[PDB]
RNA sequence: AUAAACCGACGGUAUUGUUCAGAUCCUGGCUUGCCAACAGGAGUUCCCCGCGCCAGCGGGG
């Protein structure tokens, strides 16, 4: 049995990116690999130019994300999408200089009434220990948020720690149970995969490599 | 420090003018509130005081 660090990602608004080079900023259904690394990298004091420990975090940690349905008054509330018409005045026209446009337009998608429970474990050749990752989520250095800085948390990042055989068995200890799980480690009775391009290329800033979740449906 | 960061969707604007709800219409007939009754019992009133026969009588609060 390995040690797991259990996290809770809850808030009225979330955003988990999909590939884009456009003014449209799309969200997926559950947290990304890159987004979870960034969240951890925020709790730790990692700066954007520190590629060394940026790569040390990525090589040390793997995730498992469970989608949690909001239950209210014994009624189920579904996750909905939200489109924000987001404008910027005096936005940069070039990457150097002070010339700017009057108005630019962007379109940003959010999730509403979404909540997630994240299982976290160490790779066989990890650098850090779950003990110091626990410290980081309890006392973050940079401000933690759900995808975008405008999206605060309504529940503490830290949920618990535990020991278990597989990520599914670990997430079982924490209500609410029943949601679909996406894991970096495969579990025995499941064979479905979820393709994604959310593996941050750390040697190539703001670029992403293809990878795959192992899909584990809830009962 | 997360397709992240930095980041307004903005600015102007009467809903206006006209218009009876109106005519007709008993709530109405019947019906004891009635039988019994001393307002008498019971001297606690806590003081100061003055004069006694010691029983009890007075003036001040």
UniProtKB/Swiss-Prot annotation:
GO BP annotation list: CRISPR-cas system; defense response to virus; maintenance of CRISPR repeat elements
Alphabetized UniProt keyword annotations: Antiviral defense
An example Gene Ontology CC term for this record: protein-containing complex
Molecular-function GO terms, alphabetical: DNA/RNA hybrid binding; RNA binding
Species, as recorded: Escherichia coli (strain K12)
Subunit structure: Part of the Cascade ribonucleoprotein complex, with stoichiometry CasA(1),CasB(2),CasC(6),CasD(1),CasE(1)-crRNA(1). Interacts directly with CasA and CasC. Stable subcomplexes of CasBCDE-crRNA and CasCDE-crRNA also form, both of which are able to bind target dsDNA, and at least CasCDE is able to form R-loops. CasCDE and CasCE complexes have endonuclease activity. Binding of target ssRNA or dsDNA causes a conformational change in the Cascade complex.
Keyword Ribonucleoprotein: no
Name of the protein this chain belongs to: CRISPR system Cascade subunit CasD
Top-level taxon in the UniProt lineage: Bacteria
Function: CRISPR (clustered regularly interspaced short palindromic repeat), is an adaptive immune system that provides protection against mobile genetic elements (viruses, transposable elements and conjugative plasmids). CRISPR clusters contain sequences complementary to antecedent mobile elements and target invading nucleic acids. CRISPR clusters are transcribed and processed into CRISPR RNA (crRNA).
UniProt entry tagged with the keyword Transferase: no
Gene disruption: observed consequences: Loss of resistance to bacteriophage lambda infection, loss of plasmid silencing. Decreased levels of crRNA.
Induction annotation: Repressed by H-NS, activated by LeuO. Activated by the BaeSR two-component regulatory system, possibly due to envelope stress. Part of the casABCDE-ygbT-ygbF operon.
Alphabetical list of InterPro entries matching this protein: CRISPR-assoc_prot_Cas5 (IPR021124), CRISPR-assoc_prot_Cas5_N (IPR013422), CRISPR-assoc_prot_CasD (IPR010147)
Annotated family: Belongs to the CRISPR-associated protein Cas5 family. Subtype I-E/Ecoli subfamily.
């Amino acid at each position: 049995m390995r040690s797991y660090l259990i996290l809770r990602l809850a808030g009225p608004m979330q955003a988990w990116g999909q590939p884009t080079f456009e003014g449209t900023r799309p969200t997926g259904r559950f947290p990304t690999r890159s987004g979870l690394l960034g969240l951890l990298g925020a709790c730790l004091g990692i700066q954007r130019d520190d590629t060394s420990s940026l790569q040390a975090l990525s090589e040390s940690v793997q995730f498992a994300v469970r989608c949690d349905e909001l239950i209210l008054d014994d009624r189920r509330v579904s996750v909905t999408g939200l489109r924000d018409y987001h404008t910027v005045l005096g936005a940069r026209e070039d990457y150097r200089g002070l010339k700017s446009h009057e108005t630019i337009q962007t379109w940003r998608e959010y999730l509403c009434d979404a909540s997630f429970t994240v299982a976290l474990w160490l790779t066989p050749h990890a650098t850090m220990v779950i003990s110091e990752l626990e410290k980081a989520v309890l006392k973050p250095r940079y401000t933690p948020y759900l995808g975008r800085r405008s999206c605060p948390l309504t529940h503490p990042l830290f949920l618990g720690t535990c020991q278990a055989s597989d990520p599914q068995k670990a997430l079982l200890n924490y209500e609410p149970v029943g949601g679909d799980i996406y894991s970096e480690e495969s579990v025995t009775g499941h064979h479905l995969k979820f393709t994604a391009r959310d593996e941050p290329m750390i040697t190539l800033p703001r670029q992403f490599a293809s990878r795959e979740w192992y899909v584990i449906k809830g009962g």
